Amino acid sequence: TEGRSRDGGLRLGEMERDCLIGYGASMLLLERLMISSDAFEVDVCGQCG
Amino acid sequence: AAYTFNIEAVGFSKGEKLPDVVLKPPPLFPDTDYKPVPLKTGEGEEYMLALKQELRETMKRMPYFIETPEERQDIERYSKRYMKVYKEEWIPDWRRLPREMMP
Amino acid sequence: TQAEIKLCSLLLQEHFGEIVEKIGVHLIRTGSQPLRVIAHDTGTSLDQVKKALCVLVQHNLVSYQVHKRGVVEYEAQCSRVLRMLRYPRYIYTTKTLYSDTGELIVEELLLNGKLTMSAVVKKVADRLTETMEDGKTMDYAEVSNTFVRLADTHFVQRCPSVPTTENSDPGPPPPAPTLVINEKDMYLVPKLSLIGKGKRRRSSPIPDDGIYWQANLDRFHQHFRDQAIVSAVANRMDQTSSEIVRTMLRMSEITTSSSAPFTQPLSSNEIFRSLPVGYNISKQVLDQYLTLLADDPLEFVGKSGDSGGGMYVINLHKALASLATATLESVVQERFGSRCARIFRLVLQKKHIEQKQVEDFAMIPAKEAKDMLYKMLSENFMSLQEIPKTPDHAPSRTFYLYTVNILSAARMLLHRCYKSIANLIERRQFETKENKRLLEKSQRVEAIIASMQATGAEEAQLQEIEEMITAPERQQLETLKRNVNKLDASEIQVDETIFLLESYIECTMKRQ
Amino acid sequence: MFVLVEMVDTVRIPPWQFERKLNDSIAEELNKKLANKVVYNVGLCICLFDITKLEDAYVFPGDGASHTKVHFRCVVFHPFLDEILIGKIKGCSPEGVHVSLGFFDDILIPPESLQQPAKFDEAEQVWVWEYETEEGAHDLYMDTGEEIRFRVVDESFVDTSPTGPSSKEAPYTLVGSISEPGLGLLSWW
Amino acid sequence: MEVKDANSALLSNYEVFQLLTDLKEQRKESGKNKHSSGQQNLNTITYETLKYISKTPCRHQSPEIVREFLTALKSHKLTKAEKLQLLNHRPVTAVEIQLMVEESEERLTEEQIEALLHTVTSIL
Amino acid sequence: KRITTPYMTKYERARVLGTRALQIAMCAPVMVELEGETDPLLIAMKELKARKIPIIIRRYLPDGSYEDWGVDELIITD
Amino acid sequence: GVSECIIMGIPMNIGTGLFKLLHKADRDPNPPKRPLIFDTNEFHIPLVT
Amino acid sequence: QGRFRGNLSGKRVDFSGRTVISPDPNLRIDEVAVPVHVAKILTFPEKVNKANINFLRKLVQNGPEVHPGANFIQQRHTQMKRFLKYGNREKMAQELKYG
RNA sequence: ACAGAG
DNA sequence: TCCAGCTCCACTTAA
DNA sequence: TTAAGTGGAGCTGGATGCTCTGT
């Protein structure tokens, strides 16, 4: 959630994504923006898509 | 409850008689008032119906009807010569056809 | 044309197979292709493309032209494959003007695409050995006597034949030899002194080399063009006024082209002669008919001349417009009722009309006509014009004029038919797919009758046929056959709805 | 009666099994997923015969395990049509003779393909056979399971897959015949 | 997973008699883990197969028996549906050769059929 | 011959230490003699200094070809 | 590209995501096979001509 | 505040903290002093293996209140987490497995 | 929606 | 509050 | 005389920084 009153948590912005790419950190960019927010699984049909 | 659009722009100037709300959806097959015209009968219209069955029974047996090639047969045996589906082979006129199609 | 592509994948399926329609439909769908990209854009082996194109170039369903770098590109014909449905209508209409000999001549030309004159008179002599008995043989001579009469009335024409390579381009072989059609010898048969007898199937050096014969599918359409116009004249006035139209059109066969708004006008002094002698009619009564048919605002005929006594012509494209008019109104009466078809004929004559004038001119009230007005625009039978007052085009400051467009409703109604036939083929191929259990069960119990029928056939195999459990199952097999006789017969009758629509669309296209 | 079937796979080897040789750890993992299981079009997979080609062992990001692609041949019980085996009896029923074949249990010897003198039992589950001179209508296929001889005339596969959202029939059937001379109990011939 | 071939070869039941014996030679060095059925499905399908093989006449053969049995059987003009069953099923009488070999009384002479009673039993 | 550079980059060092630390975190064998360190990344750095990590870096040239380099045969540095 | 690997949650190609790590396993590729005894080529010449 | 700038390219993460800063030169140039109130909340999943088992037993036995402690525990093939304040911790430390 | 803070 | 595309209309050459 | 390819003028649709901290 958003703010301190809601126990919100902090935001990887649009510019701190641009700094982790400059280091070439690929798995750290994956761990911050996929695993530690909203990791999920989906039933994808490989036939029709 | 009032909506985003103006109902007065749509209509309903009296203020009553809103259209009813559907509870159970309509079926897949609404019944019709009218029915199709029956078939044209006669001795001349029936012979075309007879020959059309005599084309599916004829054109499936023709050598143009290329059947799909069989594969992944299990093993060989002696019951193969009895079950070999014999059918003659037709050669085209290669003077008409291009050179690029010889077997 | 998504309906035409679905129907062509059915017509190539029952009549040619499964691994041959993938090559034919893909040329209707995509376009002109060399042989190597046909296999790549389908996924088949290179051998099967050699088998599936040689059958489609046999029956003249695909054509080809030479391009840059000598490549050979194919092209399928969409209208030519759709006329494989009218094959029983082509065999029956030659049974009228020709005998049972000529009925099996075209039937060998349509099933095999191209034949030689040496081969086609053989099989008609062969297949009519079953129709006779007691030593009487069918000879090669009288089949040719019917065959040369077929070419006189243009029902059988020569193929575009291969040219002479010794006269044109000698040397290295070209891939596609650029076939060409001549104007003189389309109907000039080669002479044959050869005769003989057909074999009765006992089961126990060529003069016409290169001269191939194929069926003229245009002449049967010109033969079906006359029977639609004459029967339209027949139902209105009289059988006596019907034959006069039949008199001119049989004379107008060899003198006009396939797409002409006006034929050559006929003088009445030779109409009286070519009219059959069994009619009690004078030359004066002949001039009575020809001035009142031109007075009809249907205008089947026109005057168009004054010299040589009574000079008279017959319209072709205006007549097909009247046939497509009666086609487009006979579908409104059966789907939306008789009173709804009153309005479609009103907006047809009174060309541009509003809501207030329809309820006056037809005596159909408010809240009964407005349902029948709105269900026709929703089915694309009637259009609007929407003349504005302002360039804002607001619906509160404009008029709405209902307007019937015939030609856009003539293509759409034809598009309804192409899906309609394919739905009939899918229903027949559904009930035959789910019931191959029962038909094999009817096959095996009759195989005891079929195999060992006479040779060593005892009488202790006649009572054991109905012993299997198929005897109460026979109620479903009679239900299966009565469905097929209503499906395949309705499958033919929609081609009558097509041909009146197909002729009206063909005569209004200029192809410039 | 055994055949080979060639398949491909991607085998996850967890990192607590790196002390052991890879070929000794691939073969155990493939038998944990294929043994006593009917792969659909090929028959009952007994065990692995040999591993024929072993590619490189990638380590993908997000895991410590190594994934390698395995080409391998599996010995599979699949008899060809009309192969004559020897089999045992488990029990009988009006639906036919239920023949056991060691590890496998679903063999159909139907009454439509039994021997001609006796076809319908006397409301007994055990099937019968009638001979005129000796043992008239009292012969029986004994439930103790003596060895018979039969001929597998028909085999048929069914797709046993989940139909519907996920929160016991046999996918490998076998139909035989006994009517030939020499097919039946070994005590008769 | 993806499947390449429905039918690759034909194995006699002697080649798996040696295989499941050699599979027992390395087994029972480690008990089952009871983390899954990973050793449950394997053990009952190796044992109950090898018990049924140990009652076939495929026992007491050798690789150099199977090679020499197919050596003498090479010229008798039999198929792979027939050369497979003569090794593993041990014909001893004349009623089973009519079943293992189709059209047995029409292709093979009665002296040559009775030779197959001697050709099988003198090797196994 | 192998034509790419023989110096280990910082990205190869980072991902080799990452994969080897995640493999030490799960119960894999340790190729060196650990002396009480509990963090898996420190043990991976001991295995990197002692040249004992069993990883083969697969360098991809962008045409499709590849080059197998061992970790213990690149010139590692700070 | 980079900005559509971050949305789809797959690791990017630049930085540490450009090379693959293999595992130096003690393994025998293309190992000694088991010999086929019955079905060889020299004993099973087919019957048909 | 759309999807492509608000929820896809940059998104709100957890295991984070934000506090006022203040100088300290007695640390090295690659160190940072995390307060105790943030270090008790921000946790790290330390997988149990052969090296750290006797360290993690003590970090479980301290519990969620004494600072070198643990806030959760999780079994091998299970996806639930047992909150370590309730129950006996010296039993859950003697029942740790590899993994 | 507004005010702050860096 | 600032800046590229899209469409309408006169303006010469050329037959 | 006019068909046509290309200039110039007005209309249109898009965009304008990163977070926490409260009411």
From Swiss-Prot, chain A:
The protein, known as: DNA-directed RNA polymerase III subunit RPC2
Top-rank taxon: Eukaryota
Gene it is expressed from: POLR3B
Binding site for DNA template strand: R4, S5, R11
Disorder named in the UniProt entry: Leukodystrophy, hypomyelinating, 8, with or without oligodontia and/or hypogonadotropic hypogonadism: An autosomal recessive neurodegenerative disorder characterized by early childhood onset of cerebellar ataxia and mild intellectual disabilities associated with diffuse hypomyelination apparent on brain MRI. Variable features include oligodontia and/or hypogonadotropic hypogonadism.
Subunit structure: Component of the RNA polymerase III (Pol III) complex consisting of 17 subunits: a ten-subunit catalytic core composed of POLR3A/RPC1, POLR3B/RPC2, POLR1C/RPAC1, POLR1D/RPAC2, POLR3K/RPC10, POLR2E/RPABC1, POLR2F/RPABC2, POLR2H/RPABC3, POLR2K/RPABC4 and POLR2L/RPABC5; a mobile stalk composed of two subunits POLR3H/RPC8 and CRCP/RPC9, protruding from the core and functioning primarily in transcription initiation; and additional subunits homologous to general transcription factors of the RNA polymerase II machinery, POLR3C/RPC3-POLR3F/RPC6-POLR3G/RPC7 heterotrimer required for transcription initiation and POLR3D/RPC4-POLR3E/RPC5 heterodimer involved in both transcription initiation and termination.
Shown residues in whole-protein numbering: 1036 to 1084 of 1133
Location of this chain's protein in the cell: Nucleus; Cytoplasm, Cytosol
Chain segments annotated as transmembrane: none
Binding-site list for Zn(2+): C45, C48
Annotated organism of origin: Homo sapiens (Human)
From Swiss-Prot, chain B:
Tissue: Barely detectable in differentiated tissues. Expressed in embryonic stem cells and in other dividing cells, such as some tumor cell lines.
Record key words, sorted: Antiviral defense, Cytoplasm, DNA-directed RNA polymerase, Immunity, Innate immunity, Nucleus, Phosphoprotein, Transcription
Lineage top rank: taxon: Eukaryota
Localization in the cell: Nucleus; Cytoplasm
GO cellular component: cytosol; nuclear body; nucleoplasm; nucleus; RNA polymerase III complex
GO biological process terms on file: cell population proliferation; defense response to virus; innate immune response; positive regulation of innate immune response; positive regulation of interferon-beta production; regulation of transcription by RNA polymerase III; transcription by RNA polymerase III
Induction: Induced by NANOG and POU5F1/OCT4. Negatively regulated by the interaction of microRNA MIR1305 with 3 miRNA responsive elements (miREs) in its 3'-UTR. Transcriptionally regulated by MYC. down-regulated upon cell differentiation.
Keyword set includes Phosphoprotein: yes
GO terms, molecular function: chromatin binding; DNA-directed RNA polymerase activity
UniProt similarity note: Belongs to the eukaryotic RPC7 RNA polymerase subunit family.
Protein's name in the database: DNA-directed RNA polymerase III subunit RPC7
Gene (name only): POLR3G
Curated annotation (Swiss-Prot), chain C:
Any one of the GO BP annotations: regulation of transcription by RNA polymerase III
One Gene Ontology term of the molecular function aspect: DNA-directed RNA polymerase activity
Species in which this protein is naturally found: Homo sapiens
One GO cellular component term noted in the UniProt record for this chain: RNA polymerase III complex
Function: DNA-dependent RNA polymerase catalyzes the transcription of DNA into RNA using the four ribonucleoside triphosphates as substrates. Specific peripheric component of RNA polymerase III (Pol III) which synthesizes small non-coding RNAs including 5S rRNA, snRNAs, tRNAs and miRNAs from at least 500 distinct genomic loci. Part of POLR3C/RPC3-POLR3F/RPC6-POLR3G/RPC7 heterotrimer, coordinates the dynamics of Pol III stalk and clamp modules during the transition from apo to elongation state. Pol III plays a key role in sensing and limiting infection by intracellular bacteria and DNA viruses.
PANTHER family with a match to the protein in the record: DNA-DIRECTED RNA POLYMERASE III SUBUNIT RPC3, RNA POLYMERASE III DNA DIRECTED -RELATED
Protein name per UniProt: DNA-directed RNA polymerase III subunit RPC3
Compartments it resides in: Nucleus
Modified residues (Phosphoserine): S193
Miscellaneous information on this protein: Antibodies against POLR3C have been found in the sera of patients with systemic sclerosis (SSc).
The keyword DNA-binding appears for this protein: yes
Chief localisation class: nucleus
Sequence similarity: Belongs to the eukaryotic RPC3/POLR3C RNA polymerase subunit family.
Record-linked Pfam families: HTH_9 (PF08221), POLR3C_WHD (PF22536), RNA_pol_Rpc82 (PF05645), RPC3_helical (PF20912)
The entry's keywords: Antiviral defense, DNA-binding, DNA-directed RNA polymerase, Immunity, Innate immunity, Nucleus, Phosphoprotein, Transcription
Stretches the record annotates as Disordered: 160-180
UniProtKB/Swiss-Prot annotation, chain E:
Membership in a protein family: Belongs to the eukaryotic RPC9 RNA polymerase subunit family.
Name of the protein described by the UniProt record: DNA-directed RNA polymerase III subunit RPC9
Role noted for this protein: DNA-dependent RNA polymerase catalyzes the transcription of DNA into RNA using the four ribonucleoside triphosphates as substrates. Specific peripheric component of RNA polymerase III (Pol III) which synthesizes small non-coding RNAs including 5S rRNA, snRNAs, tRNAs and miRNAs from at least 500 distinct genomic loci. With POLR3H/RPC8 forms a mobile stalk that protrudes from Pol III core and functions primarily in transcription initiation. Pol III plays a key role in sensing and limiting infection by intracellular bacteria and DNA viruses. Accessory protein for the calcitonin gene-related peptide (CGRP) receptor. It modulates CGRP responsiveness in a variety of tissues.
GO biological process: defense response to virus; innate immune response; neuropeptide signaling pathway; transcription by RNA polymerase III; transcription initiation at RNA polymerase III promoter
Tissue: Ubiquitous. Most prevalent in testis.
GO molecular function: calcitonin gene-related peptide receptor activity; DNA-directed RNA polymerase activity; nucleotide binding
Principal place of residence: nucleus
Portion of the full-length sequence here: 1 to 124 of 148
Keyword tRNA-binding on entry: no
Subcellular localization, as worded in the UniProt entry: Nucleus; Cell membrane
Membrane topology: Peripheral membrane protein
